[PDB]
Structure formats: C-alpha cells, structure tokens
Design a protein around this ligand. Structure first.
Ligand SMILES: Nc1ncnc2c1ncn2[C@@H]1O[C@H](COP(=O)(O)OP(=O)(O)O)[C@@H](O)[C@H]1O
Ligand SMILES: [Mg+2]
Lengths: 779, 154
C-alpha cells in the first residue's frame, strides 16, 4: 500500500484558508444542545434576562437559557491537532474539533496528555513504512497526531529515562483497540529490529490468538472475546529482546452457544473451510457446518471475510512461531473434537432415567481425536466414579446431567487449549537474552453499558474502574509537571471517595464478588439466593449499591445496579454461579491425562485427576490477574489512547453525535479535560492574546519587550486581581469568567476609539485652521 | 497664578486673543475649536457636556470660565492616541501587513460614531493619507502618525 500519507495526516493549506473564514463573532457565536447533533452552532440574536434567542443555520430560532450556551473557539483553531491549545474546551468544542478532523479523514487527535482515535472504517495509507519513517525520532509536536508518535515517544523515554512504559488502548466494542494495538506492536518490532525472526514472530501471534479468541458480533466482525496485555522487551541497546502475552476472561460460553446474529470463534469456520490439505480428513470433519450444533446456532459466515484465506494465514503463523507438526496437528484435532462432542446424542433408559448413548458415531470421532478408548469414554460420562476415601462409587447420570457435562468439557478444553497457545507463544518469544526494559500494551474492553449486563460486564467495568483511578492520578501528576514547565505552581489533589467506593463494593470482603464466591460453596443457591444476599447486604447500606432500574418493553429485569464513574449500570445475575465455577467430570479428565493425545495431557496438566481441585473460581482467578496487571502498570510511565466508534453502521465518515458523546463521557476524555483545566478553564498563547487584547493597553504593551510582561502589564492595567490568571512561559491561564470580563472591557473600549479617532481628526482640522486665523490676527 | 501652570494659562490667553473678544470671550460654538487649538482632541459628546452649543451667539464663555473646562479635558487620560488607533485599524488589516481598504476607512469615518462630514474626510485624506495601490489598499500607520502629529512614527 505504498502511497503518500500526507493528505491523511495534515490539514491542507487550502482547507486551512477555508476554515479561517467560517462565520465567527466573539459576541454571537455559541453552541446549543441538540438531540441528534449533540450541539449546534448558533447566532445569539437577542437577550432578555437569562433567556437568549439563538439563530440557527436554516432560519430556525430557539429561546433557551444562557446557562445552556457554550463558548465557541475562533476559526483559527479549526481541526486543531492538540485540543489543549483551545481557548474553550467545553463539551461542544471537543466534539466539534474531533468530528471536523474526522470528516477531514484525520483519525488521531491529541488532548493534552492523551490521544483520541476515531475508527475510520476505511483503510488509509498511514501505517506504511513510509509513514513510520516520518515519526522515528521526531517529537510529538513536530508531526501530526498519530499512534506512532506516542509509541516513538515512549520508546524514546524508555531509553532516555530508563523507565518501563505502558500504552493503554481502551474503548468500547468495535472502537479500534485491536487494530491500533497491532500497529503499535508492529512499530516496536520495526524500530527495535537488530538487523523465524523475533520481529516477525511477535506479529504472527495475532493470527493464532485472533483465530481462537475473536468472533463475529453485531458490533464487530472481529470482536476480541478476551483481554490482552503484551510486553515488548528491549535490550540495553534498545533492540528487540523478547515479549510475553497475558490474556483475560475468554468467553467460554461462545464455544457451545451463539446468539442468532453472531458467530462462534473464527477457528471453527477456518478449519471447516478446507483451505488447508489434510486437516478435515485428520479431524473427521464433514462438509456441513450445521452438522455441529455447538457452532451453528447463529451466523456461520461473515461478509468480506474469507475463512479459507484466514486458516492458511493462521496455519502459517504456527510454523513461524515454531509449532512442531505434531503440536500444530493436535491443536486442530482438539479443536474439532470440541465440535464433535456437541453431536454426541443420548437417550433415557428407565430407572432414575439413567442415560445411555444414542449412536456412537460422533463419540468415536471424539475418542480417536483425544486418543481415548471410546468404550471407556462413554462409561466415564454415563457412569462416573467418586472417592469417599478409599472406595469407588458407580454414580449414574440422566440425559440432562450428561448433556451439561459435555458442554462443560467443551468449554474447559477450548479454554485450556487457548491458554496453552499463549503459553506456547511466550516460549517462542523468550530468547533468554538480556531484557533491560519493556513497553506494555493493553488491549481490553472499556467501560460499556449494554441492555443486558452480566458477569463479564461486571468484571470489565470493575477493571475500568481501576484504570480510571490510575488515569485520574496520572493526569494530576503530569499536569502538575506541565504547569511546572510553564513556570507555574499548580496543585489540585482531591481524591473523592467514589473513586474507591465502587471498587470497594465489588472487591472488599462481603462485596459483590466476595458474596459470589461465598455463595459458590453452598448447596443450590441458584441465582435468587445470590440476588437477595446482595440486596440485604448492600441496598441502603453501600452508597453505590442501588435498586435495579425497571426494565422497558423487551428487556429482562435486572437484580441490582451500581453508580459507576461513567453511569448507572443494571446487572443481571442469572447464571453467575454457574459461570463462576466450572466443574468438570474429574473422571473424564483423568482419562484425558492418561490418553494418547500428547497435547490434551498438556492443556490438562494443571487439573488434578481423582493446583487441581481447590477453592479457586473465575472471579478469584481474575482478581489476581487484575492486581498483577495494575501493579505492573503503576510501575511504568503510561500513555492513554482513547478509541471511539463513530457510528453503529461501520460507515466511514459518518458521526453519530449521541454515540460519540456517550463515549467521551465513558472513556474518560471529558474527565481528563476537567482535571487538566481545573482552576483555569481557559488558556491562551501570547500571540493570540496580543492580537485580541492589545487594544486594551496598546502603549503599555508596546513598551514591554517580552510577551509575558506585555500580557501581565495589560492584565494589571485593567482591574484584574493578580490571582485571576497565571503568566506562563508561553501561555496565559485564566480562571472562569475572566475572558468574559476581558471581552467586556474590549467591547466598551472598542466602542469609543471611533469617536476618539474622529475627535482627533477634528483636532487636526481645527489646528489647521487656527494657524491661518492666527497669522491673520497681526496688523 | 500658581494653581494651573503659568505657561499653560498664557497659552489660553493667546487662543482667546485669536478666537474671542476681551469683553465677551469665545462663543460656545467655538469651545471645541479653542480646546483643539490647545493640543486637545475632545469628542463632540464631551463638548456638549461642558457648555458646547450649536449655532452662533447662543452662549459666550469668558476666560476664567474656560479654564476649568480646559483643566477638565486635560485631566481625563484616555481620550485616544496614536497607539489606540493603530489597534482599531488593525481590525481591518486582513493581510497582517499594515494596510486596509480606503473604502472601509472612509465608510467608517462617515457612518460610525461622531461621524464626519464629506468635506472633513476629503481634507483629512488630502493632507495625511497616502495614495492608494492598485487594489485600493492604503498604509494606515503613516495616516494616523500625521493626523496625530507623531513624527517619531514616520
Ligand atoms: N485504524 C483502522 N483502519 C482501518 N480499519 C479500522 C481501524 N480501526 C478499526 N477499524 C475497523 O473497525 C473494526 C473494529 O476494530 P477493532 O480494533 O477490532 O475494534 P476493538 O478491538 O476495539 O473491538 C475492524 O475490524 C476494522 O475493520
Ligand atoms: Mg478487540
């Protein structure tokens, strides 16, 4: 894709001149709220009290309160690359700058310390080697906004400051986290290249993990069903030295269940494509995807996606990553075995409705693939055995108990297979060479509010609750530095309880998760007992804990709610206990560990036969991961990239204002702005200050040699308390309402000079005639 | 004698000897021209507020009655200056090169504020304004420096 990236990174000179002629009156121009557009540009036509008449493009006029109006930045700040330079950074000015840039094909925008990335839904030539060369070594402000600029800056800070770095790429489903993540990694693999290369092996992890970990959803044809944290290690000389990957919360249920509009994991369809010779034969796979119920409950194809071409690429990745042929082939075997297990039918018999096999066709396929005895397999499923101490018991099982044991095994095998792929990738990427520092990249679902919020959404919103606390803390520190650079002392610290209240409600003893784990060791406790034990323990007692919002038509009722930092979320708890504990037929697992499939024994080498069988759960396991992750992040210098989805239709160039605004609130963009602008809502560079306010004290400012003193003496000249502003090295900072007063002074002053000028013109004309009248008054 | 500077009183004496008569003084319609002869530039509105009158022979202002008005006009500091007018005309300097359209300047002087007569502007431009360019632009810095008697800025 060798092209010219300039028109996709810069605002053209032609476009700039057009932008500088948009219709701006510092007195009339205003933003007003609007349902569909979020905000509309208007023209204050008249004011009566606290009500203003705003004229909109198209003749429409509205009467609304001054309270609802937001200031407009002048046209010279159009499509600004760094929104911290805007005089007003209200909600309307943020949306405006971002959408204008997006309409100009500009994906990336800086907002002070962090960066915003709006999904283009179109392939622009901004990730080429030609574009990458433009950002190597250059400082963030020397080149247009780009993910590469942040990556390079972190690589530079790492080598200069000897501190590990972090890049957190967050956002809701389909916002572009994984795309940007893969581009960052490919950038570090390039710059760090010393010269089956390590540089190519790190990139080749994506086809494997995405094949087993990604799936098509309504929001994203390539949705990530797991969280990802990858560390790129660099040697003392800054060359690529290795990498390791950690994954979180793989959606097990998708292995055996799909919604109508969604797919299971790509791999199941990639393998069925037949684009790799020998695979389907070795796996005893038919040519009818619908022969496997676990995978064909919803959609089975994705527009513009060639599962055949994807399987070849994935199969090729295994080779580059160093997967032996036996290892690669057993991965396919186990994958197909999961598909076959869903076809093993059964039927009742009589006493205790004890089940028995109804056809061993699929069962035989599973056995051969797992390297197990078919007879023994069906025997351990239908007649499992338990230990009372030193004896066996021939426990029976009905059709439903057997059915559920199958689905559990399907989920357990695939999950353990996925974990092994990650383990195998880390072995390949561990070159035992000196690792001096690392840059960690996080690719995980951001805070999001669905119609149905279940167990997964709780863990994700819990995760982001901790990421936001980390973010807020870093914004204070770095902004304090940014002020220090301007020669200003700036101190704002406040840590409101709510930053930790929700985290406590979820994580502290007797919290949401504590009760979920406590209740997991009780006899039945199916949902309703967990639900009431949550209400009786927290409702009216824990501040964030609230009553669930009643459901609207077409929605299942919720059981409780949490006032999260980004909004109120209603959680449905049905199935959490089942999802929190994943018990497997220990007798069948023992058979696996003794099977002839070497890989099957490996992925289950963790699980005991007759760690292995203790007091661990999904929630407990993930809380340790999150603690391990947050510990690692707080040891690094972080960099925040906020991804944003522009619309629900995958349409390039189309902005759903309401959808975007919601994300700006949830993804912490507006919060970060409140922090950086705390105490001084408006700032202004000195050249702009002079252009606008030198008219207030021209002679005074004309004398001062440096801009700083000119701006200062000008503010002293007018009646401004010295605490209403701060004179930085290159910027003036203003408290709320100061610019308003400065604009009033300017208006009145500007309303007089014309008379002064005319009075002076009359003085010149008068003094002209006084000379003639004077000389004519002699003799 | 020792309240308002002596030489400044003498300056007022000279103007009254030219514009007014000993017995009466200066006619109130000439109150603005008298102050202007003393190197002042008051606005028409301020002259009305200090005894200005239209037409002749409606009111007379004698010496000691004019001195407080002189000191008044000389006290108020912000009545305009060369630097003030540079900033007003910068608002028409679209090209940031120190020029504006002579049409806009002429229109503003004849339409806005205490507007001027057609004759007042023609004489003003004849003496202080430089010739236009092909596009109708003019350098407004030298025009203000001549009108405001600011040779230092030429
Ligand atoms: N920078 C980009 N260039 C081209 N297409 C993109 C870009 N970012 C996102 N997309 C499109 O949007 C989809 C969602 O991207 P993805 O990163 O998978 O979302 P997320 O990982 O945030 O769920 C991709 O499949 C791709 O088609
Ligand atoms: Mg993803």
């Amino acid at each position: 894709e060798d092209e010219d990236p300039t028109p996709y990174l810069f605002v053209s000179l032609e476009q700039r001149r057009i932008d500088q002629s948009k219709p701006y009156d510092s007195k009339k121009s205003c933003w007003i709220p609007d349902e569909k557009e979020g905000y509309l540009l208007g023209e204050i036509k008249a004011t009566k009290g606290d009500i203003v008449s705003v004229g909109l493009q198209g003749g429409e006029t509205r009467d609304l309160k001054k309270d609802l109006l937001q200031q407009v930045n002048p046209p010279k700040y159009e499509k600004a690359e760094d929104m911290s330079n805007l005089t007003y950074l209200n909600d309307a000015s943020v949306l405006h700058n971002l959408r204008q840039r997006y309409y100009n094909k500009l994906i990336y925008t800086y907002s002070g310390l962090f960066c915003v990335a709006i999904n283009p839904y179109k392939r622009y030539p901004v990730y080429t080697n030609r574009c990458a060369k433009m950002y190597r070594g250059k400082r963030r402000n020397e080149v247009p906004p780009h993910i590469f600029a942040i990556s390079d800056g972190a690589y530079v800070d790492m080598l200069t400051n000897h501190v590990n770095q972090s890049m957190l790429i967050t956002g809701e489903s389909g916002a572009g986290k994984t795309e940007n993540t893969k581009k960052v990694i490919a950038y570090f693999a390039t710059v760090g290249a010393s010269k089956g290369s390590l540089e190519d092996q790190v990139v080749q992890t994506n086809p494997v993990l995405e094949a087993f970990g990604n799936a098509k959803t309504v929001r994203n044809d390539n949705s990530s069903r797991f969280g990802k944290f990858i560390r790129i290690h660099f040697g003392p000389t800054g060359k690529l030295a290795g990498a390791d990957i950690e994954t979180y919360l793989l959606e097990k249920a998708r292995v055996i269940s799909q919604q109508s509009l969604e797919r299971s994991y790509h791999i199941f369809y990639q393998i069925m494509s037949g684009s790799v010779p020998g695979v389907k034969e070795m796996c005893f796979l038919s040519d009818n995807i619908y022969d496997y119920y676990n995978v064909s409950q919803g959609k089975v194809t994705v527009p513009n996606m060639d599962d055949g071409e994807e399987f070849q690429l994935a199969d090729q990745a295994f080779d580059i990553l160093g997967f032996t042929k036996q290892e690669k082939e057993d991965v396919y075997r186990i994958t197909a075995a999961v598909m076959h297990m869903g076809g093993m039918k059964f039927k009742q018999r009589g006493r205790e409705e004890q089940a028995e096999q109804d056809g061993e066709e699929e069962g035989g396929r599973v056995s051969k693939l797992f390297g197990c005895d078919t007879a023994e397999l069906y025997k351990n499923l239908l007649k499992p055995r338990i230990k009372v101490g030193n004896e066996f018991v021939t426990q029976g099982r009905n059709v439903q108990q057997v059915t559920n044991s199958i689905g559990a095994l399907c989920k357990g095998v695939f999950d353990r297979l996925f974990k092994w792929l990650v383990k195998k990738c880390n072995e390949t990427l561990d070159t035992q060479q000196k690792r001096q520092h690392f840059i960690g990249v996080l690719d995980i679902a951001g805070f999001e509010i669905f119609e149905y919020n279940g167990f997964e959404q709780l863990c994700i919103n819990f995760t982001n609750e901790k990421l936001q606390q980390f973010f807020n803390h870093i914004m204070f520190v770095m902004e304090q530095e940014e002020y220090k650079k301007e020669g200003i002392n700036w101190d704002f610290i406040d840590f409101g309880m709510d930053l930790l209240a929700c985290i406590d409600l979820i994580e502290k003893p007797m919290g949401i998760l504590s009760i979920l784990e406590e209740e997991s060791m009780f006899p039945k406790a199916t949902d309703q007992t967990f639900s009431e034990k949550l209400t009786n323990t927290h409702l009216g007692k824990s501040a964030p804990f609230q009553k669930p919002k009643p459901p609207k038509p077409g929605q299942q009722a919720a059981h409780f709610a949490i006032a999260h930092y980004a909004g109120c979320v209603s959680y449905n708890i049905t199935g959490w206990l089942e999802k929190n504990k994943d018990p497997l037929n220990d007798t069948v697992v023992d058979q696996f560990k003794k099977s002839q499939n070497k890989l099957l024994i490996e992925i289950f080498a963790d699980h005991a036969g007759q760690k292995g069988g203790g007091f661990a759960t999904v929630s407990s396991a993930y809380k340790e991961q999150l603690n391990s992750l947050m510990t690692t992040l707080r040891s690094t210098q972080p960099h925040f990239v906020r991804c944003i989805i522009p619309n629900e239709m995958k349409q390039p160039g189309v902005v759903d204002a309401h959808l975007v605004m919601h994300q700006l609130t949830c993804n912490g963009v507006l919060e970060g702005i409140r922090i950086c602008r705390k105490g001084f809502p408006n700032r202004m560079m000195y050249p702009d200050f002079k252009m606008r306010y030198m008219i207030l004290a021209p002679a005074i400012m004309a004398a001062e040699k440096v801009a700083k003193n000119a701006a200062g003496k000008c503010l002293e000249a007018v009646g401004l308390d010295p605490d209403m502003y701060r004179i930085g090295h290159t910027k003036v900072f203003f408290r709320a309402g100061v610019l308003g007063q400065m604009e009033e002074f300017r208006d009145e002053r500007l309303g007089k000079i014309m008379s002064w000028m005319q009075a002076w013109a009359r003085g010149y004309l008068s003094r002209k005639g006084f000379k003639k009248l004077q000389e004519q008054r002699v003799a | 004698m020792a309240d308002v500077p002596k030489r400044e009183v003498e300056n007022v004496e000279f103007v009254f000897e030219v514009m007014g008569s000993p017995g009466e003084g200066i006619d109130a319609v000439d109150l603005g021209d008298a102050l202007r002869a003393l190197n002042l530039n008051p606005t028409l509105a301020l002259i009305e507020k200090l005894g200005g009158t239209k037409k002749r022979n409606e009111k007379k202002i004698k010496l000691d009655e004019f001195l407080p008005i002189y000191s008044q006009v000389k006290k108020e500091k912000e009545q305009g200056c060369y630097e003030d007018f540079i900033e007003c005309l910068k608002l028409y300097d679209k090209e940031e090169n120190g020029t504006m359209l002579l049409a806009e300047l002429q229109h503003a002087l004849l339409a806005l504020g205490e507007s001027l007569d057609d004759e007042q502007v023609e004489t003003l431009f004849a003496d202080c304004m430089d010739p236009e360019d092909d596009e109708g632009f003019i350098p407004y810095s030298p025009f203000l420096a001549r009108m405001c008697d600011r040779p230092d800025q030429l």
